[PDB]
Ligand binder design. Structure first.
Ligand SMILES: *Cc1c(COP(=O)(O)O)cnc(C)c1O
Ligand SMILES: *Cc1c(COP(=O)(O)O)cnc(C)c1O
Ligand SMILES: [Cl-]
Lengths: 396, 395
């Protein structure tokens, strides 16, 4: 009985308090962070989005949108093919060039998403480097874990940010074996930073490749938004960059950036790259325009505003005695530690106060660390922050 | 070790085997499909005609699709801003999933970033949901299905292409108590052949297996509403899960599954490929939904009718010339050349000489001796430009 099995699988989620109820919204372009909440009763309510990943409000930026509207009128809705069969366009090459330039790399490769970029690249690296041992941070994103486990091969999990542990593991292994160390610059849920310099030092000592996921940093850190490696001057020490175009860049898609050899090899061997339709030209146009804008001094102004708003939100919430985990990033987690109560707090914030902060539970965060994750942006002014705080105070 | 050498060996190996692929850089001209501008590697520019694309019905330039995308951009902006869980669920995703559910006459549907991701995520997650699942896979199944089936560990059985006897024999041999799923396609892209849907459902029914069908090369193009080959044959009720794309005949981007509400709820609740990636941009979802609804109407029927005639016309005209055609009754037109040098020489010729863009297909993508050009005639390929292509293909 297939239906019984499905019923059991679903019940297990309810029993663990982690069954997820999605909130149907429509963000109001030109008025971010405002959205219309399409309620389950059929009603419509204005809300403030407080948990999204469009960190800099680039989703409503006129230069991004102008580029997208233009592309649609020039070449139409989609590419109509894979990169190999009619789906390689000028918009794809120009995008890849912008990305490569962002990370000061020879080349770059766009995928349908950063999830796909990670999963396809990490798994294909095992094929390209027979015997590859992948060393992975215990809190690495699912896309990386999935790519690492995908093709059979050695993996070693190191304790989160624990470079002494990483060293212990790498030193125990066959020195002749090829090696790659996979980690993040900014971890999505805690909002803490990866120890990029120390990992690069280990990698040089043990002759390993470095693979960094900067998905939660691109657009937001460094003087041109190239990420935390750019902020800290370590870009040249990273072999492969993984990033997304769907978060601070405000559009959709993902990428790797690396040497021309690395990129040419991955694109020639990765099934996830080869056997899927290329990104729509309009998406590629918008993303490129977003990347280019964020490399400028005008882009720096949005980063400065984000950091200032994040700082202020954190002050205000600490002032209440909220349990906020503050690692110094733009991410503002409030840990509840129970999946059911996290949903209850989130539900009451939404329905009674028009504050939308999705409850975050397993498998996105470890069991018992369920939380609300605030993502203050340049469009969340000091008055919105005030309004949120007040709602949180009233709610306790 | 020496990483750059290892990369060099990987690349050089493709060059040695003649299978290093050179991307051609094109920009299709909206309002003038199949026309495009070729950005040549020597720096030159030239107009060409696209003859090997998967935007089969010209929906990529349809005014209703584009209207919906421009509106959505202005209403809600460039992307969703999150995963389906974290702020990325919009009325655009919901209405899209409702339209797809309705197309396949299922309780629900689930959209992914692509059909590649839908297949990969779904087939791998089903092993989790149905402990001990054995998956019976057609030997010519798409990469995405193969990758989903191998992703998570568990039993698999590859049956020889379209060989229902081989499938029977494999399934009757297995543990009768084991959960079972049979994965296949309605239309296989390279040869353009049809899967024997009715006879695979018969076996599924006899042995208590689930049926999983990839209708990527049939959705939009077959059945009275473009729901696929299972719709055309009246078998949609006997399929448990449909896989489809929004990127080919629908002219946009994305993919889906369509199944019962329990199936969809389980997959969306368990598949990391669904959970941990940004939802489709609402403009893409608006465009895809508009394309689908349009292709369910009589006006969409006219597009399918036209495609079918053009395909029929190209095949006859090439056969009348004495050319070797792998003809299985579909919209796909594979012309056989039998050697990789002569295949590339004909596509380089067609492109350079007449502006006809058709990619060559050699080993390992098809066997040695089956090397061919795959033509994808569309309603925008009028009777006059088919005439041009026939006359060009007089060596
Ligand atoms: C092209 C193709 C896919 C993948 O669809 P995308 O939406 O481009 O990822 C899946 N299955 C088959 C049979 C295909 O041909
Ligand atoms: C969301 C996320 C991804 C995947 O990004 P998409 O572009 O949405 O697939 C990859 N890595 C991290 C750390 C992420 O948070
Ligand atoms: Cl091992």
């Amino acid at each position: 009985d297939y239906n019984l099995a499905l019923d059991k699988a679903i019940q297990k989620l309810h029993d663990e308090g982690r069954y997820r109820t999605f909130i149907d919204i429509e963000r109001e372009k030109g008025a971010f962070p405002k959205a219309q909440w399409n309620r389950p009763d059929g009603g419509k309510q204005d809300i403030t989005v407080w948990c999204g990943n469009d960190y800099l409000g680039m989703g409503q930026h006129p230069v991004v949108l102008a580029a997208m509207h233009e592309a649609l009128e020039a070449v139409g809705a989609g590419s109509g093919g894979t990169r190999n069969i009619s789906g390689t366009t000028a918009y794809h090459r120009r995008l890849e060039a912008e990305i490569a330039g962002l990370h000061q790399k020879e080349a770059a490769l766009v995928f349908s998403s950063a999830y796909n970029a990670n999963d396809a690249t990490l798994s294909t690296l095992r094929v390209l480097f027979p015997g590859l041992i992948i060393y992975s941070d215990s809190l690495n994103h699912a896309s990386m874990i999935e790519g690492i486990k995908r093709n059979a091969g050695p993996k070693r999990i190191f304790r989160h940010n624990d470079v002494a542990h990483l060293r212990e593991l790498i030193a125990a292994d066959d020195p002749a074996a090829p090696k790659l160390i996979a980690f993040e610059s900014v971890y999505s849920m805690d909002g803490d930073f990866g120890p990029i310099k120390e990992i690069c030092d280990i990698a040089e000592e043990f002759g390993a490749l470095t693979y960094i996921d900067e998905v939660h940093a691109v657009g937001m850190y460094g003087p041109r938004g190239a990420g935390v490696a750019e902020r800290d001057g370590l870009m040249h020490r990273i072999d492969i960059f993984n990033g997304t175009l769907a978060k601070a860049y405000g559009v959709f898609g993902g990428y790797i950036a690396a040497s021309a050899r690395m990129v040419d090899a991955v694109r020639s061997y990765a099934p996830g790259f080869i056997f899927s339709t290329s990104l729509p030209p309009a998406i590629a146009a918008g993303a490129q325009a977003s990347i280019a804008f964020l490399k400028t001094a005008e882009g720096q102004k949005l980063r400065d505003a984000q950091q200032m708003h994040a700082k202020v939100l954190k002050m205000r919430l600490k002032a209440l005695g909220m349990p906020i985990i503050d690692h110094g990033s733009h991410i503002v987690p409030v840990v509840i530690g129970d999946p059911v109560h996290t949903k209850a707090v989130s539900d009451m914030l939404l329905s009674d106060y028009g504050v939308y902060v999705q409850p975050i539970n397993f498998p996105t965060v470890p069991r018992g660390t369920e939380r609300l994750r605030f993502t203050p942006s340049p469009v969340h002014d000091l008055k919105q922050i005030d309004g949120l705080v007040h709602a949180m105070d009233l709610l306790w």
